[PDB]
Symmetry: C3
Subunit: 107 residues, 3 copies
């Protein structure tokens, strides 16, 4: 999948997590978020397809995405110990991260 | 998982997508298809375990699988924007791709 | 996700597989197990963060995890051909593998 496809997956997974009841759906959706973030890290946003791969404007993208993956792993571990709500709360903060980053590169 | 395990996953995921109603199940199953295709790309079909890794007969396999992954990403982006049916239709064309390729290397 | 997050995912996925009825939920959960095992292979258990990457005590971890991934692929192929119960039985043996390995590095 390409970059905005994966960011779209992240947004909708967030809608899945928010409306979920048990630990397993939250954890599953969080793992889908993990996969999709990983790929969009390997991908390149459309507005950025014409800047240097060693450009700071692109390398910034690389580390913001590193950040996203980190936060997702944290939330996954909270959903892992079974704290389904503290993990849903981490997902709130996560949607903050995801929205900032999608907005910066949506174009 | 090995190659035919992943092609089997693809076929059954297709059966999941066809009988699905909402956008999220289609998108989830499509992501499972993404993962499984990726791995079977890294794997090697049984009938092909004895041809050169630089063989055209094997390198053909490599690019047909590249094709499959590409089509899956497209269908994922249609299921991402919420076009659950146009994505189900892309999944139809996808089952064409998947069946051709499984048939070529099933043995 | 980090190492114990992925081992926790494996344990709970096992609880999903045991209480499942159809082939598709077993296969899906097994694929989540595949992903999570892969990552925890790339990760490093907390008690092991201070031994050589070429240490036998760490390289042992690397191959025990190789073993786990192998068994998961086998079980996935049984769940692929639709043998939902023989795959549930492989999942029994799998929980043996997973528990041994989580116990060895839990700390």
């Amino acid at each position: 999948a390409d970059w905005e496809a994966a960011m779209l997956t992240l947004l909708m997974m967030l809608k899945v997590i928010e409306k979920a009841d048990n630990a397993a759906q939250v954890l599953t959706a969080l793992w889908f978020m993990a996969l999709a973030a990983h790929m969009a890290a390997l991908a390149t946003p459309p507005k950025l397809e014409d800047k240097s791969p060693a450009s700071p404007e692109m390398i910034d993208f690389r580390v913001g995405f590193e950040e996203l993956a980190t936060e997702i792993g944290k939330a996954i571990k909270l959903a892992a110990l079974g704290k389904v709500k503290e993990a849903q709360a981490a997902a709130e903060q996560l949607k903050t991260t995801v929205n900032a980053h999608w907005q910066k590169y949506r174009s």
